[PDB]
Ligand binder design. Structure first.
Ligand SMILES: Nc1ncnc2c1ncn2[C@@H]1O[C@H](COP(=O)(O)OP(=O)(O)O)[C@@H](O)[C@H]1O
Ligand SMILES: Nc1ncnc2c1ncn2[C@@H]1O[C@H](COP(=O)(O)OP(=O)(O)O)[C@@H](O)[C@H]1O
Ligand SMILES: C[C@H]([C@H](C)[NH+]1CC(=O)NC(=O)C1)[NH+]1CC(=O)NC(=O)C1
Ligand SMILES: [Mg+2]
Ligand SMILES: [Mg+2]
Lengths: 363, 363
């Protein structure tokens, strides 16, 4: 029959029917990842987790980091995970979201941007503010992949504060609680991922170790923000000290700790380099998004560095990149590989002569 | 201002603003690909092309191949490319699309499924009919990335034929031309890709060589269908003869043509194997989609074959796979890597003892 065979779906129903095209695999994947385990901290090991779950988390986390670019007066992000209750909350300060009726869509601005698809402050490519956000899906994707999803924000400029809760995959919602407000701006997103959509029973060791690492990553990647994880400040300040998490207790060929060369080439390019004993490795960030497969920004810096010293060189390089790119593109929705051409990055990276010399004498 | 900063987009406007998240990169990419060049045919070489363009083409092409699964009485697909006029047309026979009013959406069924987003015959996972189609975007994506887009179809069962033309990125359309019809069913999609969205001036040698290869690929992958390219039947029948396109004039270490082992393990798994002298290579298809990066179906067969003969073995294998999978998933929209777990493929592949023995004595 024609109406059973040929079907239109709503957007919301399409996301739930085709989860993997929006949030990546909802099936387990086993691979070697850098994670931060409670007892031993930063280590590379075999991890089994669901990419789709990692990704709705990372979406809320990158949104906090974007706010720093939105408002440089932002100083802090708190990340909290309660595995036993199934709760994740991410809090930032600095400017909040205007708590007012949008005059075109006739709803409160936070309602619109967390409750309706294809909504964003980043559709105009006002180049400046190099946010990881771009498409206007991430926050709704978390909401839809959650049994419960709470947005609190307050914006002094607009004199009000906002709270609204969503439930059952964004199919159900309270009315906004709206109040007068004159305090410090904050946004706080609190959600319970819908573990049944990922075939998991609990947030397990492996996913909490992955999620914990992204909080370190934020401390490492996001200049000028303290990060607290479960109520504690992460002892990371500057990129070099984040890199130190990885090279702590690594040896060269002669049993001597690794030497690390660092240059902040400009605001958009922070670069550390040492010897690899394990082939080509890279740790890299674009707009605080972890490009774990890398891409054109890694190629761009590595070609330069390889410039001085053919592809056998690449084989002994361990490169750490923290960069900012205008309108990053990715070869998939899980964003581990950034595909933008160098031409249209909006910046250049020229490492100094001091760095190339310093890079000779390290391995 | 709040309504300039916080924006909702329509679906259509979002696709045009964020092309790369739907059709892959709209920027050039340079890499080594198998292509079919007019003069020399199947060869591996350096090619510069736009993934997004390849992909709207491939979407119309996989839809033709899916129809074979829809109706096994289908015998032919004609592919035609006129670079100078900027026209691509793909014709298939076998059952057409019901030319009737959809009683729920109140439009002609072909209008609905080529003119409205998120429309498909493949949303119910009626496992059987292992089509590459699944999400209900592909055909609209071609339409949207076209200056002009024409759908003709006819379905004898429903006594009518249909023609409708779309223009300017699916923003403009004629009324359906609807007629009485009693002839042989066909569907014919004719489009002019919008070269301005891909920064190209003409369909160039490299893209026509890529597109031509997919027609060979179809002849190779789609059992029981003749393929014509620019009015000529492709001299391919069966998978072994397609594989022959690749191994023609290849040598082993002793200057002797490559020996090729073939088994059709079952309808869903056709497998050819020879020696590689160039590391691990694979040519593979899932539901007639070219998995050029491979995935869990390649891993599945290779592990088996590697089973008999550790990862140094992989290094001397050139494997060709034509398979059928129920509800394939992919790690990106350009679908070169298939991510479904073997468990839920809907079939098994056990290669016979004859094949493992035959595979010893080939290199
Ligand atoms: N923590 C936050 N602080 C302030 N604004 C936020 C925060 N999280 C999200 N937003 C706003 O909500 C919008 C919707 O977010 P999202 O769905 O992630 O889309 P985007 O791709 O723009 O990040 C953002 O564009 C931004 O304007
Ligand atoms: N050549 C064809 N012959 C018959 N039906 C077709 C053809 N091309 C497309 N269709 C129909 O149009 C629908 C829309 O196509 P598409 O956007 O590619 O989505 P899907 O992911 O289902 O392939 C298909 O589901 C199928 O029902
Ligand atoms: C929009 C989707 C993208 C993958 N589409 C959905 C689909 O099923 N098929 C397609 O080819 C197009 N992307 C993921 C997401 O969550 N947000 C995006 O805008 C991109
Ligand atoms: Mg975002
Ligand atoms: Mg299709």
């Amino acid at each position: 029959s024609v109406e059973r065979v040929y079907q239109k779906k709503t957007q919301l129903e399409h996301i739930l029917l085709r989860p993997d095209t929006y949030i990546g695999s909802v099936e387990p994947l086993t691979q070697f990842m850098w994670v931060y385990d409670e007892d031993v901290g930063m280590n590379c090991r075999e991890v089994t987790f669901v990419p789709g779950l990692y990704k709705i988390f990372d979406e809320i986390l990158v949104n906090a980091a974007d706010n720093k670019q939105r408002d440089k007066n932002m100083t802090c992000i708190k990340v909290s995970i309660d595995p036993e209750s199934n709760i994740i909350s991410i809090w930032n300060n600095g400017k909040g979201i205007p708590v007012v009726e949008h005059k075109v869509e006739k709803v409160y601005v936070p309602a619109l941007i967390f409750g309706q698809l294809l909504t964003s402050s980043n559709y105009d490519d006002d180049e400046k503010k190099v946010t990881g956000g771009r498409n206007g899906y991430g926050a709704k994707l978390c909401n839809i992949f959650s049994t419960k999803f709470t947005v609190e924000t307050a914006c002094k400029e607009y004199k009000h504060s906002f709270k609204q809760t969503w439930m059952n995959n964004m199919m159900k919602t309270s009315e906004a609680k709206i109040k007068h407000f004159d305090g410090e701006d904050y946004t706080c997103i609190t959600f319970q991922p819908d573990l049944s959509k990922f075939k998991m029973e609990k947030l397990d060791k492996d996913i909490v170790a992955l999620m914990t690492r992204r909080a370190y990553d934020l401390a490492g990647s996001c200049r000028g923000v303290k990060v607290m994880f479960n109520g504690k400040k992460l002892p990371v300040n500057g990129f070099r000290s984040y890199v130190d998490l990885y090279v702590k207790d690594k040896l060269d060929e002669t049993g001597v700790a690794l030497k690390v060369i660092h240059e902040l080439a400009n605001e958009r390019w922070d670069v550390c380099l040492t010897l690899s004993e394990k082939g080509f490795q890279q740790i890299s960030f674009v707009n605080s998004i972890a490009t774990t497969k890398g891409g054109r920004h890694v190629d761009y810096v590595v070609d330069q560095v390889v410039g001085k010293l053919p592809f056998q060189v690449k084989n002994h390089i361990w490169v750490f990149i923290n960069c900012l790119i205008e309108n990053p593109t990715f070869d998939s929705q899980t964003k581990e590989n950034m595909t933008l051409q160098p031409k249209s990055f909006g910046s250049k990276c020229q490492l100094s002569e001091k760095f190339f010399k310093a890079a000779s004498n390290c391995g």
